[PDB]
Amino acid sequence: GAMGAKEYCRTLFPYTGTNEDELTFREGEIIHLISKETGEAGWWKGELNGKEGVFPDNFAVQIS
C-alpha cells in the first residue's frame, strides 16, 4: 500500500525505545522513513541516528 519514495518525518514528541527494534528519539528529529507498513497499522519504521526501528506514528508528523 505504501511506497517508500524517500519519505521523511519529524517527531512532535520524544519517545524512549524500550526495545532495540524500537527507535529512541527526541523532538525535532527528521527521521528517514523506511516503511509505513511494518505489518502493523500504527507502527512506522524509520531510520534515525543509524538505527532503523519501529515507532508509533502518533509521535511524528510527516515532512515528505
PDB file of C-alpha atoms in Angstrom, residues 12-36:
ATOM      1  CA  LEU A  12       6.447  16.030  17.588  1.00  0.00           C
ATOM      2  CA  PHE A  13       7.175  14.283  20.828  1.00  0.00           C
ATOM      3  CA  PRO A  14      10.181  12.386  22.168  1.00  0.00           C
ATOM      4  CA  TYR A  15       9.936   8.662  22.722  1.00  0.00           C
ATOM      5  CA  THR A  16      12.123   6.265  24.523  1.00  0.00           C
ATOM      6  CA  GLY A  17      12.597   2.943  22.860  1.00  0.00           C
ATOM      7  CA  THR A  18      12.368   0.119  25.299  1.00  0.00           C
ATOM      8  CA  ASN A  19      13.094  -2.440  22.697  1.00  0.00           C
ATOM      9  CA  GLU A  20      16.134  -2.346  20.471  1.00  0.00           C
ATOM     10  CA  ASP A  21      13.871  -2.587  17.415  1.00  0.00           C
ATOM     11  CA  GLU A  22      12.122   0.377  18.895  1.00  0.00           C
ATOM     12  CA  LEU A  23      13.552   3.740  17.988  1.00  0.00           C
ATOM     13  CA  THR A  24      14.524   6.169  20.753  1.00  0.00           C
ATOM     14  CA  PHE A  25      14.057   9.717  19.512  1.00  0.00           C
ATOM     15  CA  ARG A  26      13.906  13.307  20.662  1.00  0.00           C
ATOM     16  CA  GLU A  27      11.558  16.026  19.369  1.00  0.00           C
ATOM     17  CA  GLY A  28      12.587  17.851  16.233  1.00  0.00           C
ATOM     18  CA  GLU A  29      14.252  14.899  14.686  1.00  0.00           C
ATOM     19  CA  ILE A  30      13.976  14.337  10.985  1.00  0.00           C
ATOM     20  CA  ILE A  31      13.735  10.614  10.570  1.00  0.00           C
ATOM     21  CA  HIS A  32      14.299   8.735   7.360  1.00  0.00           C
ATOM     22  CA  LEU A  33      11.110   6.842   6.830  1.00  0.00           C
ATOM     23  CA  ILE A  34      11.825   3.304   5.776  1.00  0.00           C
ATOM     24  CA  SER A  35       8.404   1.694   5.837  1.00  0.00           C
ATOM     25  CA  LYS A  36       4.903   2.733   6.905  1.00  0.00           C
TER      26      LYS A  36
END
